[PDB]
Structures are given as C-alpha cells and as structure tokens.
Amino acid sequence: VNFNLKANTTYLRLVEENDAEFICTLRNNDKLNTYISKSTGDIKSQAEWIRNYKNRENNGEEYYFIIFRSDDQSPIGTVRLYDFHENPKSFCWGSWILNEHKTKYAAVESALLVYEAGFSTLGFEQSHFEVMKGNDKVHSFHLKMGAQKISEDDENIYYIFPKSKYKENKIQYARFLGKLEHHHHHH
Ligand SMILES: CC(C)(COP(=O)(O)OP(=O)(O)OC[C@H]1O[C@@H](n2cnc3c(N)ncnc32)[C@H](O)[C@@H]1OP(=O)(O)O)[C@@H](O)C(=O)NCCC(=O)NCCS
Ligand SMILES: Cc1cn([C@H]2C[C@H](O)[C@@H](COP(=O)(O)OP(=O)(O)O[C@H]3O[C@H](C)[C@H](O)[C@H](NC(=O)C[C@@H](C)O)[C@H]3O)O2)c(=O)[nH]c1=O
Ligand SMILES: [Mg+2]
C-alpha cells in the first residue's frame, strides 16, 4: 500500500526509524502526554520500536504516520492505524498527538485523513478507538464528528465510527480536505 494523504494545512507520511527522536520528544512532553501510554525517552529504544513496527507495516497490519504542516514542512504530530479485525472489517486508531506548532485545524484534518486511509485506501467497514475519562475535549471532538459512544471501563470511553458517517463527513467537511470546487453564495 502507498498513501497519498494530504489536507488543506497538513499532510501525513509513514513513520521511519529516523523519526525516533521527534517521537520520543513528542511522547515525553508532559503537556501532551496526560492521556497516552508512557513510552521510552531513549532514541535508540524508540528506533527499535519503529523497526518492529515496520515489520507489521510490511505485512499490512499497522500504519503509523508523522503529521506535518504543509506551509513549512515541519513535523507537528503523530497518528496510527492498528489492531485490525473481521466480521465486520475493523481498524483501531490512536497514538494521536499534535504539538504547539500544529496548524489551527490540524486535529480535524488529521482525523479525516485517518478515516480516508482506513475506509477508502484500506477498505475497512468500522473504526474502533478509546479516549481516557478526563480527556474532555477529545470526547467532545469525537462525538461532534459522529463517533458513537458504545461503552467503558474505569479508565476509558470506547467508541466506534462507522464508514457510513465518514461518507457524510466527506461532503460536510470538504472545506478541511482541500479547496472547494464551488462555493456556496447567498443572494
Ligand atoms: C488530541 C489532540 C490531537 C486534539 O487536537 P486539538 O488541536 O487539541 O483539537 P481541537 O479539538 O482543539 O480541534 C482543533 C480546532 O478545530 C475545531 N474543531 C474541532 N472539531 C471540529 C468539527 N467537527 N468541526 C469544526 N471545527 C472543529 C476546534 O474547535 C479547534 O478550533 P479552536 O481553535 O476554534 O478551538 C491534541 O489535543 C493532543 O495531542 N492531545 C494530547 C494527546 C492525546 O490526548 N491524544 C488523544 C488520546 S485519546
Ligand atoms: C506509538 C508508540 C507506542 N509506544 C509504546 C507505548 C505502549 O507501551 C505501547 C503501545 O502503545 P499504545 O497502543 O497504548 O499507543 P498510544 O500511542 O499510547 O495510544 C493508545 O493509548 C492511549 C492511552 C490512548 O488511549 C490512545 N487513544 C487515541 O489516541 C484515540 C484517538 C482517536 O483519540 C491509544 O491509541 O507502545 C512506543 O514506545 N512508541 C510509540 O511510538
Ligand atoms: Mg504519498
């Protein structure tokens, strides 16, 4: 598979071993990591994590991206599709992090591109993910875009996002993905 994921102000490309330092730094930023998993601050350890990740990628099992801002081609975060299953065909996503240098609407664009990748580039039917209780704005984001709060445990709320909702969102959210082919005008 090869991806061509770009929106208005951001673009995504697959993680390489050389992104290890950017990743270590991002994930060990205490302003960003309140609700994600602890991980190594050691660059070589992170390079190793990516090498294993690359085997999974080679076998169609996982796709992990650096998020870039288009205007200066500088890295602003991460996102991942992982843990694929069947009946129905489902993917998880997460590892979703944006730093201070993010564009304003990067969160919207990157989420949309995830769903482009999963539902159209990879042919899944459903998306699953979770968000820690307390990560209030992220709950609100996902509910707004159309995720369905299935359920929960002591830590998380568990969501699914159906392919059907992604197809509505392509029209409603077209302004985030590219320049419009025609604009609405009221007389
Ligand atoms: C999760 C994360 C990537 C979200 O990015 P964010 O920039 O904080 O997301 P926001 O919800 O602020 O969305 C960005 C902007 O688009 C707007 N927006 C969000 N959803 C929208 C929608 N459906 N329609 C239109 N606008 C929308 C927001 O209001 C915000 O604009 P504002 O500047 O006017 O507030 C980021 O907060 C982060 O890295 N957090 C730490 C790591 C983490 O917890 N990851 C998630 C684990 S569950
Ligand atoms: C991606 C990555 C992970 N790790 C380590 C950290 C863990 O010990 C292990 C597995 O990581 P996880 O699967 O928990 O990845 P993580 O990026 O922390 O994110 C996941 O766990 C978090 C606690 C969050 O729940 C996260 N959820 C989301 O981001 C969902 C979005 C849609 O809001 C979810 O994807 O691997 C690394 O050491 N380096 C890495 O680059
Ligand atoms: Mg490409």
Side-chain angles (χ1 to χ4, degrees):
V1 185
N2 102 279
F3 300 91
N4 297 290
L5 304 167
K6 58 182 294 137
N8 254 12
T9 73
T10 55
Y11 61 91
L12 303 205
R13 69 129 178 88
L14 294 172
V15 167
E16 304 296 340
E17 275 184 52
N18 213 337
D19 297 312
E21 173 173 31
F22 174 66
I23 293 175
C24 283
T25 297
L26 185 69
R27 286 187 73 91
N28 286 278
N29 190 332
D30 296 327
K31 298 160 176 207
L32 299 180
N33 68 9
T34 308
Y35 301 112
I36 76 176
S37 295
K38 299 182 169 191
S39 65
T40 188
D42 172 59
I43 296 174
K44 280 167 173 156
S45 300
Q46 178 64 45
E48 188 189 337
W49 197 98
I50 296 171
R51 190 183 313 120
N52 288 124
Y53 153 70
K54 277 297 199 203
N55 297 333
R56 297 201 295 291
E57 188 200 289
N58 293 158
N59 292 321
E61 296 164 354
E62 195 161 316
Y63 300 101
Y64 190 13
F65 302 85
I66 306 299
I67 305 172
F68 278 89
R69 71 185 283 161
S70 299
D71 66 353
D72 67 2
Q73 302 92 54
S74 76
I76 56 167
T78 60
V79 71
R80 193 162 62 110
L81 291 69
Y82 69 106
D83 193 14
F84 301 167
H85 294 265
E86 321 223 79
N87 304 280
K89 208 159 169 296
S90 70
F91 69 100
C92 301
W93 76 280
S95 311
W96 186 33
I97 312 162
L98 287 171
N99 64 24
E100 244 178 351
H101 193 45
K102 67 186 176 192
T103 53
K104 191 167 175 63
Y105 301 118
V108 181
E109 293 184 13
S110 61
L112 296 165
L113 287 174
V114 163
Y115 296 134
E116 210 182 288
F119 294 126
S120 92
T121 307
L122 297 171
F124 288 94
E125 286 302 303
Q126 287 213 319
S127 189
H128 300 175
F129 55 90
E130 61 263 331
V131 180
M132 282 192 78
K133 292 180 144 144
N135 205 358
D136 297 318
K137 194 167 178 183
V138 178
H139 300 287
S140 173
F141 180 95
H142 294 302
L143 293 157
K144 187 166 174 53
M145 191 168 284
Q148 195 202 158
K149 190 154 172 184
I150 284 157
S151 81
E152 87 202 282
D153 60 20
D154 288 340
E155 292 174 25
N156 297 327
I157 297 165
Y158 293 91
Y159 294 90
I160 78 300
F161 189 97
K163 181 171 193 191
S164 72
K165 180 62 67 186
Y166 148 82
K167 292 175 137 136
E168 301 163 31
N169 290 8
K170 266 198 305 210
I171 305 131
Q172 183 175 342
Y173 288 79
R175 67 187 174 94
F176 290 101
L177 288 164
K179 293 197 164 129
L180 294 173
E181 310 299 349
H182 184 264
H183 290 255
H184 292 148
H185 170 60
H186 289 176
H187 304 311

